[PDB]
Design an enzyme around this catalytic site. Structure first.
Site, PDB file in Angstrom:
ATOM      1  N   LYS A   1       2.878 -14.735  -1.108  1.00 26.57           N
ATOM      2  CA  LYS A   1       2.432 -13.844  -0.042  1.00 26.57           C
ATOM      3  C   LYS A   1       1.055 -14.316   0.436  1.00 26.57           C
ATOM      4  CE  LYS A   1       3.708  -9.282  -0.051  1.00 26.57           C
ATOM      5  NZ  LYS A   1       3.534  -7.819  -0.313  1.00 26.57           N
TER       6      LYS A   1
HETATM    7  C1  LIG Z   1       3.729  -6.961   0.627  1.00 25.27           C
HETATM    8  C2  LIG Z   1       4.279  -7.402   1.948  1.00 25.27           C
HETATM    9  O1  LIG Z   1       3.217  -7.347   2.896  1.00 25.27           O
HETATM   10  C3  LIG Z   1       3.641  -5.484   0.332  1.00 25.27           C
HETATM   11  O2  LIG Z   1       3.255  -5.286  -1.045  1.00 25.27           O
HETATM   12  C4  LIG Z   1       2.642  -4.767   1.238  1.00 25.27           C
HETATM   13  O3  LIG Z   1       1.311  -5.256   0.970  1.00 25.27           O
HETATM   14  C5  LIG Z   1       2.690  -3.242   1.044  1.00 25.27           C
HETATM   15  O4  LIG Z   1       3.932  -2.725   1.573  1.00 25.27           O
HETATM   16  C6  LIG Z   1       1.568  -2.461   1.750  1.00 25.27           C
HETATM   17  O5  LIG Z   1       0.255  -2.946   1.439  1.00 25.27           O
HETATM   18  C7  LIG Z   1       1.626  -0.964   1.450  1.00 25.27           C
HETATM   19  O6  LIG Z   1       0.605  -0.292   2.180  1.00 25.27           O
HETATM   20  P1  LIG Z   1       0.613   1.312   2.283  1.00 25.27           P
HETATM   21  O7  LIG Z   1      -0.573   1.576   3.178  1.00 25.27           O
HETATM   22  O8  LIG Z   1       0.410   1.829   0.860  1.00 25.27           O
HETATM   23  O9  LIG Z   1       1.961   1.754   2.813  1.00 25.27           O
END
Ligand SMILES: *[C@@H](CO)[C@@H](O)[C@H](O)[C@H](O)[C@H](O)COP(=O)(O)O
Ligand SMILES: *[C@@H](CO)[C@@H](O)[C@H](O)[C@H](O)[C@H](O)COP(=O)(O)O
Ligand SMILES: *[C@@H](CO)[C@@H](O)[C@H](O)[C@H](O)[C@H](O)COP(=O)(O)O
Ligand SMILES: *[C@@H](CO)[C@@H](O)[C@H](O)[C@H](O)[C@H](O)COP(=O)(O)O
Ligand SMILES: *[C@@H](CO)[C@@H](O)[C@H](O)[C@H](O)[C@H](O)COP(=O)(O)O
Ligand SMILES: *[C@@H](CO)[C@@H](O)[C@H](O)[C@H](O)[C@H](O)COP(=O)(O)O
Ligand SMILES: *[C@@H](CO)[C@@H](O)[C@H](O)[C@H](O)[C@H](O)COP(=O)(O)O
Ligand SMILES: *[C@@H](CO)[C@@H](O)[C@H](O)[C@H](O)[C@H](O)COP(=O)(O)O
Lengths: 223, 223, 223, 223, 223, 223, 223, 223
Positions: free
Chosen positions: A86
């Protein structure tokens, strides 16, 4: 549509996998640092997830510079064939994606908030792009609209990058993603749990049970 | 969608190319003459751009008459295989495009302001057609509507001329172009630099950095 | 639709005012600081604008705290009956707006980027709310969509706060604002001067002039 | 919808007025120069039109500067109460309209090619605004779309300026103007004539005549 | 919506009137001459219809020239206060309508085949305008679209002329007219008779009769 | 979309062909009679057009009966392989088309005014069908709607007959034909000329010239 | 779209066939009984139609029971390879269709009034299904809406049964059927003859004839 | 679209099967328990349905736990190759479906009330998914909307699971399912018998009968 679990909580992951409805996992530095407490080390958590999950497991680099990103990406890749690196939507990140794609290392571009960022990640060769829909909702913009535009753009140019909807907060993000035709959604455990449930399912089962008792006292089906 | 840089500023071009998000360059007589001052020769600028940029580089003829256009086009073509000859939408220009196409010299028809002019350019065999959106916005017409009609027309007739959206002024011209399905956009450097950016990307990175420090004070990922 | 000039440049203001097409002026700390150079003082610039402009002139507070904002606001108010106090969309800002509104001091809520922020400013009693369209365009969202939603919301609740579209970048922001029905646009000078122009206007005048000379050598209309 | 005749041809005007279908006339310097031939003087032509026509008669100033426009406008107004002064969409033009409106002299702003020009004219207090639809068609833009937007804008702000559609070329410009709800169309004589006609009207008349002969050889209705 | 009977057949008219669903009658020279055979005089037929029908009765002039139309119109008017004079859409007809309107004689403009002809008739002051839908269907154009446009146009200008849909061929012309909002439809007797009928009405009545016999063998309701 | 020239004027044809924008020509008996004046013979005019034009050239039969049409068609076909025989939409016409199609002679069915006429022509095997849009506009129906329906019908049944839009009056007929997807438009010379032109093209050219002078006084591009 | 003639009148059939525009014929017991008078026998009428018509000829069974329907069907089949057996939408009818379809006897399911009836006929293997549009119009439902739904359903399931629109009453049933994409329409003779006609066709021919006489006195086209 | 009978009543099934319009049967514990009274055994009922229905017959497990579901499913499978095992939308149900799919045992996932439940069932490899439309109607949501979304989602991902619409209450559920393109509907016997019927079918047959008697007193068709 593939359904991934968005967590670093190993209990959640084990449970979801045992349900057989989880196709993969996404993590990020916040999720990992949440679990790496009371003696838990982040290396161990990452390795444990990679072992338990058959499908793709996204793990985020922490370096902000090209050379550091590529070096960390190679180590992440070395941990298992299901590892996906990522990488954030930045100038250095796009450069890292381009290099890693040429090295046949699967990538996931994260922190995407509009369709053109997503298109740039696709053009760099990224395996998955992850627009965030909940964080857009947070700031008063319907995040699902961005997913819809990305799907149209990718359809226009026959783009092979998969849309991996992230920052999911409720089951309607999931429903709308499927109607749009996103490739993957990654969901927190609470949301995942909700997806199989409906009050009329429960009510219908209870009625079937009651009616069957009329003809079979012990509730058995003997054929 | 290809993304070209619309400038003759060599510094901007080197920077954009190093970012890895620039697929080609477009110039015109105004852009070049802007740079070719205080000693700098226009011939040197053109050659430097052709050397720096791997992808297509559009260079405009200045002759208004058929014979002069073709003579200039051949000279432009001889400067490098990536040169594309920019020719205006005029009677003489359509004649020159037809001749140049038969000679396998790539062409870019410019100063197009409605969908029928773009169709005529495609009929002459032009490689790229460049409708101007900002100059239409300037006179109170939404320029993007012309792009939308050109895409429909080109789709109808399975036209192979690429739509190269020009006179781009902002990132929504770029977004709308991608949603319509234009083949290429050419953008000034200021617009280019904004495309990768979003405040929630910066904010998410800062939070990830902060959370990670909690499990790795030095801020690295040891795997 | 009212049309205001978005600048602190006295020359631009004097010019636009003398054209007869400027209904008011908006300033902000960036615009004023641009002009307050080579010995020019911000206090003189503001008073000079108030004098030249018969219509509303918005002037922004610099304090970030409630008490300072209302102190500055009352001082701005004291400069002329046409002064309007520009206050940002913050917790302190809304408290300030509510207080000033009760004091019958006209207010303009600025730095609004979504329709719910605009609604909150209206609920505090603000005279004008200024959503920023260009800065949304900058980050890959079509800012005009927010103006459309605000107009719908305000219509629903018969809200008296006026929509004052700001961060205007081109004449199509102006066109779309009028079609939506925004109450006011405020525009930079370069945009203002473009609004009257069209090439077919110029072409048509030239033809009329030529034809008339056929019957009136001197070009007179003697009646 | 009022229908004006767009001509300075006295014979056409007399004929149209006697059909009883003409509510006014518009001229311009080209139309007048066309008639002012072979001894015919423009001043006589203008006066005769004012005489023959009961409705508004638009007569265009030829000066391009504010003072000359206002001087000529006052002279035009002096020729009869039905005279309306045609002023072009220019900086000087808008100033003239404002002055003349305050003097209770009716005005018609001409050479308008987009909706924001039309709005500026309305803001200056003009009695009629005249967007040109045929000349937009000429340059590959459907001119009727501009009329649609102006109607919406004027509805939004309860603008009292009348939309007077000009540069009409065919009966569909007229039909679309009526469906949109333009206040007035001005049409060339040849278009005017065509509006009453349809082949099924002629065919139905012939058939009624033939059928009536069967019951009345002389073709009269005797009651 | 008023429903008129479109015939000169006195038997049809008496029958329709006795049904209580006929609000008026329209005739034309073909309809009348069809009935005025084998001794029957057209003058007698017209007078009988005027006597029988309480509501408006349209009777068409046969003259093609202004003076003859008006002379015939006055005679028609003198036959009864419910007479309405049918006048064709021609130059002479528009003149006659205008004169007759000023004399307070009700008029019905006929042989109208597009929305602009209908507008011209309204401008002449006509009481009813009769666009023909079936004769348009005959030549491959959906006649009802013209009704839809006329309603929109009349709504736009708050026109008081009633839309009297004619050349009706089937009950869907009638249904679509009502959904559009036409003021009147005039229908042939065969169409009229079908309007009250539906197979489920007959079927429901039969069932009600059958069920009621179960509690009242003689089939009555004693209360 | 192919563009044909709708004229029998030899000078226009030569000019259009040399612009390189003309793919064919259509004539009819009116257009030819216009040219066959002052000693010029129709047979010479037709032969010269076939000579000058490489693409299809439509020439209309004058006989109204089947045998005469087929005899004249065979003669027209004998004059050159690019000749296409124009046949009117009549009973005899359809029979002629069927016969001629079986003889491998290309046909163009003309005087079509609705979509079902066009379908009947296609069913007879016609090479091109020519609906007339301007003459529909004349009678107050938007002729472009008929082209839209024919395109849909032909798409439904995979009809190979080409839609050749005729009675073109302005550049918007051309634009709308292209957006709909008509196979061919045939246009008068005056319309043809206007298609290449736009005031912003001229304006942009002038500006490029002026700017280039700054860097090259002689206005040449020397490479 | 195929066009069949819906009649048992030999004169109409011979005429339509000789026009070249009739692809087949549909009959029913009402149509045949109309013709079988003054000594004409239904058996002769049927055989005569089969002989004259090269395309499909539908002939309806009169039995109401399965066994009788298949007996009659086999006899109808035995009359000619172009015979198609018309069977009503009833329980017995569907059973008959299924049997006959397996025997490779072509079938036409009639008296269909909604899309699910049409689907059931298709599921039984019927060659053609005939929804009735006019008889729906009779009862105040737009029958064309049922054709549109049937086309959608058949498309969804790639159904090979052809939609044969029946109870056609006017040329707009025919137009709408073609725009929807029905496979076949069957039309009464009066409707058939109207399909080729348009007043502008007649008008246009007359004008061409007149113009031509200007250059060819005899009206010849000698080539 | 396949049409199944939703009942365990052998008389209804035998009847529908005889009609030739039933493609399969669905049952559930309520339906079976209903019939298994007064000495009738559920085992006999199930076997009897399997014997007389050529097509798929769905039979629901009664266990709520994975192991019991899989065991009961194998027993059902063993009763005949047309048996389809109905399994509820629960965690253990999805696990069972996955296992049974790997054993090539056809499955039908039931008690589905939203599109994401339907998607999870598809992801488990289920042969049919059965969303319930009537039970949604019961609680005030239009259940057909879930069918529409499921169709779109399954189309997006080329899902091979068949949509088997259940809890059908009326023929409009059937119509809408066909228009949407659902693979199968299962319907109660009362609904099934209504599908073939329409009053205009009955009325049309009666008229054909009456007319034929004119030509053939005995009501026969002799060929
Ligand atoms: C990885 C793909 O980008 C994933 O872990 C994302 O980083 C998360 O879905 C988000 O950071 C979650 O953010 P939220 O504001 O808690 O909904
Ligand atoms: C060439 C066309 O592909 C390109 O350089 C164009 O000439 C420019 O995009 C425009 O001239 C830019 O015009 P603007 O008015 O600065 O936006
Ligand atoms: C005040 C709000 O009415 C106004 O001066 C705004 O502050 C300006 O319109 C914006 O700050 C301009 O921002 P941009 O990014 O230059 O377009
Ligand atoms: C005055 C506006 O009310 C009117 O006379 C206009 O000037 C004319 O309608 C146009 O000049 C006509 O131009 P076109 O190009 O001939 O259509
Ligand atoms: C008078 C107009 O209100 C009315 O009698 C009309 O003349 C008729 O409705 C039409 O002439 C009927 O024509 P069709 O062709 O028979 O339908
Ligand atoms: C032939 C059809 O391909 C073509 O020459 C047509 O006959 C003409 O386009 C029309 O006759 C032109 O008519 P208009 O009324 O002048 O527009
Ligand atoms: C057979 C079906 O293809 C066909 O003959 C139909 O029976 C007829 O089209 C209808 O019976 C005609 O009914 P209408 O009520 O006269 O229009
Ligand atoms: C099985 C497919 O899931 C089928 O038997 C269903 O169980 C029934 O269609 C429903 O249970 C019927 O419920 P309703 O509430 O009676 O409509």
């Amino acid at each position: 549509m593939k359904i991934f679990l968005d967590t670093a909580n190993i209990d959640e992951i084990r449970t979801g996998v045992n349900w057989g409805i989880v196709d993969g996992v996404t993590t990020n530095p916040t999720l990992i640092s949440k679990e790496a407490v009371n003696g838990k080390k982040y290396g161990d958590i990452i390795r444990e997830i990679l072992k338990i999950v058959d499908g793709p497991v996204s793990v985020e680099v922490v370096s902000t510079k090209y050379e550091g990103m590529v070096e960390e990406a190679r180590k992440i890749h070395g941990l298992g064939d299901n590892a996906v690196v990522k990488i954030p939507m930045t100038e250095d990140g796009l450069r890292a994606i381009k290099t890693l794609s040429s090295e046949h290392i699967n990538t996931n571009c994260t922190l995407v908030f509009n369709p053109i960022q997503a298109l740039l990640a696709a053009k760099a060769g990224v395996t998955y792009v992850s627009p965030f829909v909940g964080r857009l909702d947070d700031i008063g913009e319907d995040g699902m609209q961005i997913i819809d535009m990305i799907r149209t753009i990718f359809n226009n140019y026959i783009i092979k990058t998969q849309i991996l909807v992230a920052s999911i907060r409720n089951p309607i993000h999931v429903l709308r993603s499927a109607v749009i035709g996103a490739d993957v959604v990654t969901v927190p455990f609470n949301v995942l749990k909700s997806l199989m449930k409906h009050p009329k399912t429960d009510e219908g089962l209870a009625k079937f049970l009651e009616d069957w008792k009329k003809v079979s006292p012990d509730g058995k089906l003997i054929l």
